Design a protein around this ligand. Structure first.
Ligand SMILES: [K+]
Ligand SMILES: [K+]
Ligand SMILES: [K+]
Ligand SMILES: [K+]
Ligand SMILES: [K+]
Ligand SMILES: [K+]
Ligand SMILES: [K+]
Ligand SMILES: [K+]
Ligand SMILES: [K+]
Ligand SMILES: [K+]
Ligand SMILES: [K+]
Ligand SMILES: [K+]
Ligand SMILES: [K+]
Ligand SMILES: [K+]
Ligand SMILES: [K+]
Ligand SMILES: [K+]
Ligand SMILES: [K+]
Ligand SMILES: [K+]
Ligand SMILES: [K+]
Ligand SMILES: [K+]
Ligand SMILES: [K+]
Ligand SMILES: [K+]
Ligand SMILES: [K+]
Ligand SMILES: [K+]
Ligand SMILES: [K+]
Ligand SMILES: [K+]
Ligand SMILES: [K+]
Ligand SMILES: [K+]
Ligand SMILES: [K+]
Ligand SMILES: [K+]
Ligand SMILES: [K+]
Ligand SMILES: [K+]
Ligand SMILES: [K+]
Ligand SMILES: [K+]
Ligand SMILES: [K+]
Ligand SMILES: [K+]
Ligand SMILES: [K+]
Ligand SMILES: [K+]
Ligand SMILES: [K+]
Ligand SMILES: [K+]
Ligand SMILES: [K+]
Ligand SMILES: [K+]
Ligand SMILES: [K+]
Ligand SMILES: [K+]
Ligand SMILES: [K+]
Ligand SMILES: [K+]
Ligand SMILES: [K+]
Ligand SMILES: [K+]
Ligand SMILES: [K+]
Ligand SMILES: [K+]
Ligand SMILES: [K+]
Ligand SMILES: [K+]
Ligand SMILES: [K+]
Ligand SMILES: [K+]
Ligand SMILES: [K+]
Ligand SMILES: [K+]
Ligand SMILES: [K+]
Ligand SMILES: [K+]
Ligand SMILES: [K+]
Ligand SMILES: [K+]
Ligand SMILES: [K+]
Ligand SMILES: [K+]
Ligand SMILES: [K+]
Ligand SMILES: [K+]
Ligand SMILES: [K+]
Ligand SMILES: [K+]
Ligand SMILES: [K+]
Ligand SMILES: [K+]
Ligand SMILES: [K+]
Ligand SMILES: [K+]
Ligand SMILES: [K+]
Ligand SMILES: [K+]
Ligand SMILES: [K+]
Ligand SMILES: [K+]
Ligand SMILES: [K+]
Ligand SMILES: [K+]
Ligand SMILES: [K+]
Ligand SMILES: [K+]
Ligand SMILES: [K+]
Ligand SMILES: [K+]
Ligand SMILES: [K+]
Ligand SMILES: [K+]
Ligand SMILES: [K+]
Ligand SMILES: [K+]
Ligand SMILES: [K+]
Ligand SMILES: [K+]
Ligand SMILES: [K+]
Ligand SMILES: [K+]
Ligand SMILES: [K+]
Ligand SMILES: [K+]
Ligand SMILES: [Mg+2]
Ligand SMILES: [Mg+2]
Ligand SMILES: [Mg+2]
Ligand SMILES: [Mg+2]
Ligand SMILES: [Mg+2]
Ligand SMILES: [Mg+2]
Ligand SMILES: [Mg+2]
Ligand SMILES: [Mg+2]
Ligand SMILES: [Mg+2]
Ligand SMILES: [Mg+2]
Ligand SMILES: [Mg+2]
Ligand SMILES: [Mg+2]
Ligand SMILES: [Mg+2]
Ligand SMILES: [Mg+2]
Ligand SMILES: [Mg+2]
Lengths: 97, 126, 218, 79, 24, 55
RNA sequence: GGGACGGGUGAAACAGGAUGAUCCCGCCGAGACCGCCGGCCGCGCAGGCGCCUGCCAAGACCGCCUCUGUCAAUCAAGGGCGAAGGCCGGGGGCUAGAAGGCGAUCAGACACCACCGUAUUCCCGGCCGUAAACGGUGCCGCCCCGCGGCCGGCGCGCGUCCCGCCGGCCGCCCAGGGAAACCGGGAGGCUCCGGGCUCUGGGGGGAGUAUGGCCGCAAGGCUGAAACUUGAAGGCAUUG
C-alpha cells in the first residue's frame, strides 16, 4: 500500500475536520469534502407528456415548473451505480467534466 | 370551471391519488395503487396507478368536478426526494380522462435542519 | 354506508376587494343537522390562491406569488375572506440559488396600526460586475453588514406604520421589493431582492370593521 | 542584458521591498499643505495616523487609512 | 486474527489474571 | 375493442436475448415492443393505446 | 372529512386498520438540528469551527522616518488543553440506537436485510488522557529554473482594470534527489559526508506479555524484561 492520490482521495485543504453528510442511496456517513456531488435540474412532468399537460391547461402563458436537486453519494454507491468509473493510471489525473 | 385539488403521493411503496376542495378540509374521491393489484411489489408501479386514476375519474365526474390543481410529492422527511414510478402516470391518466389542468406544484416536505435518519454510520450493508 | 353527498351543499368564496378575479370557487359542506350548523363549520377555512389567478393577464410577473385568505364571515350565502399570509412558490425559491455568490436571509417582527403582528422574511443575493476578472461573487464583511442594516432601515421606513389593506396593496404590487433593490443597489451588485414570506403571528379576535372595509371597496 | 548588482537601476529597485534593497531605506516622506482659508503652509508626514490640525482650525484635517493618509478639503505639495 | 480483536482477547485475559490473583 | 396501429419505423432489439423489437407506430407516435419479425408498414393489433414502452 | 386496506423488501413475513387506520387540512406539545448557498473558501496551539440579535475579552497579518536594546532557539523534570466511546453526581428525553426481543434467509445464522426497543446520544459540575489524534513527514534559520489559481493588507500606473510588494493556502514542474513509488514551498543544496536543539530505531517471534513502581472510582494509562524459538519477515516495482 503506497500512496494512490496526491489529494488522498478527498478535497481537504488547511483545516482539521469537516462536516458529515448522509449518502442518499445507502445512508452511510461520509465527510462533506469526500462525497460525490451532482446537481440536477429537471421537469416535474416527464418530457413524454410535456405537451399534453400544456395543451390541457386553462391558464394562459403557463410554464412547466422545474425541480432542483443536489444528489450526494458515497464512493461505493457511486461506483456501483456508475456515477463514476474506475480509471487508468494516466486517466486518473484528468479533472475534465 | 369547478376547481378541486389533486394530491398525488408518489412514494417508494405505494401511490395515493386524492381529490379535495380548494381548502383541503373536504375530500371528494380517494384511491390508492394497492387497491388494484395482488402483488405487493406492484403497488407503486405506473399500471396500478393508471387503473386507480381511471376510477377516480368516474368518482369525481359524477360529483360535478371538472378541473384540478396538482400538488405532487415524494416521501420527503429525511428520506427520498425523487418521485415514485406512478407519479407521471396519474397525471397522464388524468389528462386522458377529460379533466382540465390548472396550477402545478411540488409539495414534498423538506426540512430546514433535520433529525438523524435510520441506517447507522455504515449504511444499509447489502 | 349511505353516500354522504346526498346531504351536501356548496357555498361561494369571495376575495377581498383589492383583486380583480373576485370568485375563488365553491366549497362543499353537510347540511345543518342537530347541533352542527353549516354556516358555523365552513367559517375560518384557509385558501391558498395564486396571484396570477386573482389578477390575471400578467402571468410572467404574478405567477410565482401565493396569497393565503381565510373566511371570517358568512353573509347572504357567501363567504368573505381576509388576508392570512403571503408566500412564493417552491420552484421559484429553488431557482434563486447558485454557487459562487452570497445568500442573505433576514426576518423581523412588524406591528401594524390596527392590532396585527407580522413576521416578514426577505432574501437577497450578490452578483457579478460587468467587468471583473474573477468568477466568484463573494463579498467582504463590511459589505454584508451594510446590506443587512440597509434592509432593516428600509423595512422600518416603508412598513413602519401601515394598515392591513395598505399592506395588501403593497404586497400585491411589489412596491416594497422595488425599493429593497434601490437601497441595496447603492452598495454592491445584487440580483434577486424580494420579500419571500409574510406570516401573521397574532390578530384581534374581532375583525368585523377590517373585513367590512376590505370587502366593500371603500 | 548585463546588469551589475553593485549599481542597480533605481527604478526597478524602488519596486522591491524596502528591506531587500541593496541599502535599506524608508518609503515615506514629508510634504507641504496649504490651509484652504489661511495663507500659511504646514509640513505633514505622508503616513500619519494621529490628529493634525490647522494653525487656526479646531477641526482635524487628516483621515488615517491604514496606508498613506488622506486629508479633508486641503490642497497639497511635496516638499 | 485481526489485531483489534487480539487486543480485546488479551485485555480479557489480563483482567481474568488480576481477578484470580485477587484471591489470596 | 382492439385498435389497428401501423409501424412507422424500427428502433432496435430490446431484450437481453434479442427477441422483441422496439417500434414506432401510428395521430400519435406511440412506442411499443413486438415479439415477431416486423418490417416497415406492418399493421399491429393493439389491445390498448394506454401503455407506452420504456425508454 | 372520507371509506378499505396500509407498512416494509431484491421478494416477503412480524408490527398497524370498521375502537375508521393509511391519506387531506387546521390547532397544540416537547427535545434535538442548523439545509440549498457550502468552496484545490476562511479561522484556531492542536482536538476542532456554520440559525437571529446583544454584550465581553482576544488574535495573526499588513502599513509606519513610533519605543526598548539581545531581552533569543530548542527543551529532561514540571504545568495546561485534548475527537468519539466510557465513568461519578444532578437534569432532560424528539431522533437514531450498543444490549435484549422478534420476522425472514440459510445445511446452520446466535450475522448481514425487516420491525420493536435499554444505556447512550443533549445540558450542568467533575474524572479519564486515548485514535490511521495522518502530511503515516518534529522545531528554529539560509539559498533555491520557472508557469499558473485563490484569500488578506498595501503601493504605482493609465481609463473597473493593470503591474508589483509582504503574508497564507493550493496545482504543475527543468535541475537535483531516491530502491523505487514519487519529492521538488523538499524528500534538493550530502560517501564532494560537520548551522543549532529535542525525541525514536537496530532480523522475525515470544510481547507490549510477566514482574515491580506511579497515576485512575473503574475501565485503563505510563514505564517495561528474560528463558526459549526461528531463516527469513518486510518495502517498492515487472510479467502472468
Ligand atoms: K505495503
Ligand atoms: K502506506
Ligand atoms: K480519503
Ligand atoms: K479549508
Ligand atoms: K473546511
Ligand atoms: K464530486
Ligand atoms: K464508501
Ligand atoms: K393489496
Ligand atoms: K427532522
Ligand atoms: K428514520
Ligand atoms: K428506528
Ligand atoms: K438495526
Ligand atoms: K450502520
Ligand atoms: K442512523
Ligand atoms: K444500525
Ligand atoms: K456503525
Ligand atoms: K465507523
Ligand atoms: K466502515
Ligand atoms: K462503525
Ligand atoms: K444498517
Ligand atoms: K466577517
Ligand atoms: K470584518
Ligand atoms: K460572520
Ligand atoms: K522584493
Ligand atoms: K516596500
Ligand atoms: K508605502
Ligand atoms: K494497531
Ligand atoms: K489494532
Ligand atoms: K482497539
Ligand atoms: K389487500
Ligand atoms: K433530533
Ligand atoms: K457562506
Ligand atoms: K467563501
Ligand atoms: K462564505
Ligand atoms: K471562515
Ligand atoms: K473566506
Ligand atoms: K477570506
Ligand atoms: K467560510
Ligand atoms: K466566509
Ligand atoms: K501607516
Ligand atoms: K530563549
Ligand atoms: K537551538
Ligand atoms: K517546546
Ligand atoms: K515534557
Ligand atoms: K512532562
Ligand atoms: K478534555
Ligand atoms: K475524549
Ligand atoms: K457514557
Ligand atoms: K430519548
Ligand atoms: K434530550
Ligand atoms: K455504546
Ligand atoms: K438484533
Ligand atoms: K455472527
Ligand atoms: K458473519
Ligand atoms: K425503533
Ligand atoms: K453507556
Ligand atoms: K439518556
Ligand atoms: K455521538
Ligand atoms: K440527546
Ligand atoms: K474524555
Ligand atoms: K500508530
Ligand atoms: K490521513
Ligand atoms: K521534537
Ligand atoms: K483576493
Ligand atoms: K488578494
Ligand atoms: K485570509
Ligand atoms: K483581499
Ligand atoms: K488583496
Ligand atoms: K494580493
Ligand atoms: K511574497
Ligand atoms: K509568502
Ligand atoms: K505570495
Ligand atoms: K505553503
Ligand atoms: K521534542
Ligand atoms: K519521537
Ligand atoms: K517515537
Ligand atoms: K518508539
Ligand atoms: K505484575
Ligand atoms: K485508585
Ligand atoms: K474502588
Ligand atoms: K464505576
Ligand atoms: K482496580
Ligand atoms: K486495576
Ligand atoms: K497496570
Ligand atoms: K515483502
Ligand atoms: K511492513
Ligand atoms: K506486510
Ligand atoms: K506495512
Ligand atoms: K523499482
Ligand atoms: K521488488
Ligand atoms: Mg513595506
Ligand atoms: Mg491538565
Ligand atoms: Mg483535563
Ligand atoms: Mg425512535
Ligand atoms: Mg425507537
Ligand atoms: Mg498512542
Ligand atoms: Mg497519531
Ligand atoms: Mg504519529
Ligand atoms: Mg486557496
Ligand atoms: Mg486551498
Ligand atoms: Mg502546493
Ligand atoms: Mg535512538
Ligand atoms: Mg502490575
Ligand atoms: Mg505494577
Ligand atoms: Mg523492483
Amino acid at each position: 500500500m503506497p500512496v494512490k492520490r496526491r489529494n488522498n482521495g478527498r478535497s481537504k485543504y488547511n483545516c482539521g475536520h469537516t462536516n458529515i453528510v448522509r449518502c442518499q442511496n445507502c445512508h452511510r456517513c461520509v465527510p462533506k469534502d469526500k462525497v460525490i456531488k451532482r446537481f440536477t435540474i429537471r421537469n416535474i412532468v416527464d418530457n413524454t407528456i410535456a405537451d399534453d399537460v400544456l395543451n390541457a391547461c386553462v391558464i394562459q402563458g403557463f410554464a412547466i415548473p422545474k425541480l432542483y436537486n443536489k444528489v450526494q453519494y458515497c464512493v461505493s454507491c457511486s461506483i456501483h451505480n456508475h456515477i463514476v468509473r474506475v480509471r487508468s493510471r494516466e486517466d486518473r489525473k484528468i479533472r475534465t467534466p | 370551471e369547478a376547481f378541486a385539488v389533486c394530491h398525488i403521493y408518489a412514494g417508494k411503496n405505494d401511490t395515493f391519488i386524492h381529490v379535495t376542495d380548494l381548502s383541503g378540509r373536504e375530500t371528494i374521491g380517494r384511491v390508492s395503487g394497492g387497491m388494484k393489484v395482488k402483488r405487493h411489489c406492484d403497488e407503486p408501479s405506473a399500471y396500478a396507478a393508471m387503473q386507480a386514476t381511471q376510477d377516480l375519474i368516474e368518482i369525481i365526474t359524477d360529483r360535478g368536478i371538472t378541473a384540478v390543481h396538482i400538488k405532487i410529492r415524494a416521501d420527503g422527511g429525511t428520506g427520498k426526494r425523487v418521485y415514485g414510478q406512478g407519479g407521471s402516470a396519474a397525471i397522464r391518466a388524468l389528462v386522458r380522462g377529460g379533466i382540465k389542468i390548472g396550477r402545478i406544484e411540488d409539495s414534498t416536505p423538506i426540512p430546514t435542519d433535520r433529525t438523524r435518519h435510520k441506517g447507522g454510520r455504515r449504511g444499509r450493508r447489502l | 354506508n349511505p353516500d354522504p353527498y346526498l346531504k351536501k351543499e356548496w357555498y361561494p368564496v369571495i376575495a377581498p376587494a383589492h383583486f380583480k378575479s373576485r370568485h375563488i370557487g365553491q366549497t362543499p359542506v353537510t347540511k345543518t343537522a342537530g347541533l352542527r350548523v353549516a354556516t358555523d363549520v365552513i367559517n375560518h377555512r384557509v385558501y391558498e390562491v395564486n396571484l396570477g389567478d386573482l389578477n390575471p393577464g400578467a402571468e410572467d410577473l404574478n405567477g410565482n406569488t401565493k396569497f393565503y385568505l381565510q373566511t371570517q364571515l358568512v353573509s347572504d350565502g357567501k363567504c368573505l375572506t381576509n388576508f392570512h399570509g403571503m408566500d412564493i412558490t417552491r420552484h421559484k425559491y429553488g431557482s434563486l440559488f447558485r454557487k459562487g455568490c452570497d445568500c442573505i436571509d433576514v426576518f423581523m417582527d412588524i406591528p401594524t396600526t390596527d392590532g396585527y403582528l407580522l413576521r416578514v422574511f426577505v432574501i437577497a443575493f450578490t452578483d457579478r460586475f460587468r467587468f471583473q476578472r474573477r468568477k466568484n461573487c463573494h463579498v467582504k464583511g463590511r459589505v454584508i453588514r451594510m446590506m443587512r442594516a440597509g434592509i432593516y432601515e428600509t423595512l422600518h421606513n416603508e412598513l413602519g406604520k401601515v394598515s392591513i389593506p395598505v399592506l395588501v396593496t403593497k404586497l400585491s404590487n411589489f412596491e416594497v421589493n422595488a425599493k429593497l433593490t434601490e437601497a441595496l443597489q447603492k452598495i454592491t451588485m445584487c440580483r434577486d431582492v424580494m420579500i419571500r414570506r409574510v406570516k401573521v403571528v397574532k390578530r384581534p379576535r374581532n375583525t368585523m370593521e377590517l373585513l367590512s372595509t376590505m370587502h366593500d371597496s371603500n | 542584458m548585463n546588469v551589475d548588482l553593485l549599481y542597480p537601476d533605481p527604478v526597478e529597485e524602488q519596486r522591491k521591498h524596502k528591506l531587500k534593497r541593496l541599502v535599506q531605506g524608508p518609503n515615506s516622506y514629508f510634504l507641504e499643505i496649504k490651509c484652504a482659508g489661511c495663507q500659511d503652509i504646514v509640513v505633514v508626514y505622508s503616513h500619519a495616523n494621529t490628529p493634525v490640525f490647522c494653525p487656526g482650525c479646531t477641526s482635524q484635517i487628516s483621515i488615517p487609512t491604514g496606508g498613506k493618509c488622506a486629508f479633508t478639503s486641503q490642497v497639497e505639495r511635496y516638499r | 486474527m485481526r489485531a483489534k480483536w487480539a487486543k480485546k482477547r488479551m485485555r480479557k485475559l489480563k483482567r481474568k489474571r488480576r481477578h484470580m490473583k485477587a484471591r489470596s | 375493442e382492439p385498435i389497428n396501429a401501423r409501424v412507422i419505423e424500427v428502433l432496435g432489439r430490446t431484450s437481453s436475448r434479442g427477441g422483441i423489437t422496439q417500434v414506432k407506430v401510428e395521430k400519435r407516435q406511440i412506442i411499443r415492443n413486438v415479439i415477431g419479425p416486423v418490417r416497415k408498414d406492418d399493421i399491429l393489433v393493439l389491445m390498448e393505446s394506454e401503455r407506452e414502452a420504456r425508454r
